[PDB]
Amino acid sequence: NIPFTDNLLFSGQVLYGDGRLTAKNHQLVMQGDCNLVLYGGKYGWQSNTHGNGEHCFLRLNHKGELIIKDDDFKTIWSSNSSSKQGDYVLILRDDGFAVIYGPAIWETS
Amino acid sequence: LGTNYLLSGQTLNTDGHLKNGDFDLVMQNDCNLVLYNGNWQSNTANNGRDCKLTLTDYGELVIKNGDGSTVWRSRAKSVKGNYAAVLHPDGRLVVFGPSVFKIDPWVPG
Numbered sequence: 001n002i003p004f005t006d007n008l009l010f011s012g013q014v015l016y017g018d019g020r021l022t023a024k025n026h027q028l029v030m031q032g033d034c035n036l037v038l039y040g041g042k043y044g045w046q047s048n049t050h051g052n053g054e055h056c057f058l059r060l061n062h063k064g065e066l067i068i069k070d071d072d073f074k075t076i077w078s079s080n081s082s083s084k085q086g087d088y089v090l091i092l093r094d095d096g097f098a099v100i101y102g103p104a105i106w107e108t109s
Numbered sequence: 110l111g112t113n114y115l116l117s118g119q120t121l122n123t124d125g126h127l128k129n130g131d132f133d134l135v136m137q138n139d140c141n142l143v144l145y146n147g148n149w150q151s152n153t154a155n156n157g158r159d160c161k162l163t164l165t166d167y168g169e170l171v172i173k174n175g176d177g178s179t180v181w182r183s184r185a186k187s188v189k190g191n192y193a194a195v196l197h198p199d200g201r202l203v204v205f206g207p208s209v210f211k212i213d214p215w216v217p218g
């Protein structure tokens with residue numbers, strides 16, 4: 001497992017049970033009610049998936065797709081942003097946008 | 110600027126930091142870009158004054174002196190787009206890109 005950073009979600013990492021990303025006043029929350037909610041910006045954002053499943057979780061895969069699965073691995077919501085195989089990161093930026101970047105093209109080690 | 114990431118079009122100014130726990134990335138006054146506790150540096154000490162770290166629209170990290178002359182570059186490049194250089198909690202600086210998805214809480218969409 002990868003250590004957690006408040007404003008980041010790397011490929012393989014999971015959020016659930018009100019686990020969240022935070023930056024300034026912005027929060028991106030995988031709520032217990034299966035709704036993925038961004039509290040911040042001007043209007044906020046939601047996946048609009050309240051009660052669509054039980055014990056749902058958020059996971060960014062290694063193709064850059066961000067998915068909400070329920071306890072039985074039924075797809076609840078997807079970013080539908082599948083791209084090249086590699087390492088990705090979801091950043092809840094200081095400016096309120098939550099953006100998926102990848103694959104990783106360069107590293108120090 | 111975010112505390113642990115740099116976006117394409119943004120600048121990490123002289124004596125500026127990117128930090129994630131014990132790993133502290135500094136664009137120093139002596140032009141050396143040093144990842145403290147991460148056993149990595151650009152190895153450009155005394156190569157210029159008022160040096161700045163930028164990230165191109167091709168995902169290349171660039172160190173330029175005060176006059177805008179290129180002192181160092183990461184060499185790895187990809188397609189024109191929006192990139193993000195992230196200080197991973199395990200102590201690597203990683204360039205991810207291009208962006209494949211964005212949540213916009215500033216516009217109802």
Ligand SMILES: OC[C@H]1O[C@H](OC[C@H]2O[C@H](O)[C@@H](O)[C@@H](O[C@H]3O[C@H](CO)[C@@H](O)[C@H](O)[C@@H]3O)[C@@H]2O)[C@@H](O)[C@@H](O)[C@@H]1O
Pocket residue numbers: 031032033035037038039040043044045046050
């Ligand atoms: O500003 C963000 C967003 O807020 C509104 O949508 C999010 C709400 O959607 C559902 O009503 C719920 O998921 C709600 O979650 C709260 O209430 C739940 C029970 O009703 C509870 O289980 C949760 O823990 C939480 O308290 C969300 O808050 C809406 O205004 C959007 O337009 C807006 O973008």
Ligand SMILES: OC[C@H]1O[C@H](OC[C@H]2O[C@H](O)[C@@H](O)[C@@H](O[C@H]3O[C@H](CO)[C@@H](O)[C@H](O)[C@@H]3O)[C@@H]2O)[C@@H](O)[C@@H](O)[C@@H]1O
Pocket residue numbers: 137138139141143145146148149150154
């Ligand atoms: O422990 C990591 C690493 O440390 C050493 O590399 C980093 C140093 O590289 C150069 O010596 C300088 O860039 C130095 O920067 C400090 O000293 C400068 C001159 O006084 C000053 O201007 C800077 O502001 C800064 O204080 C870096 O600290 C080296 O021993 C590596 O082998 C070792 O891996």
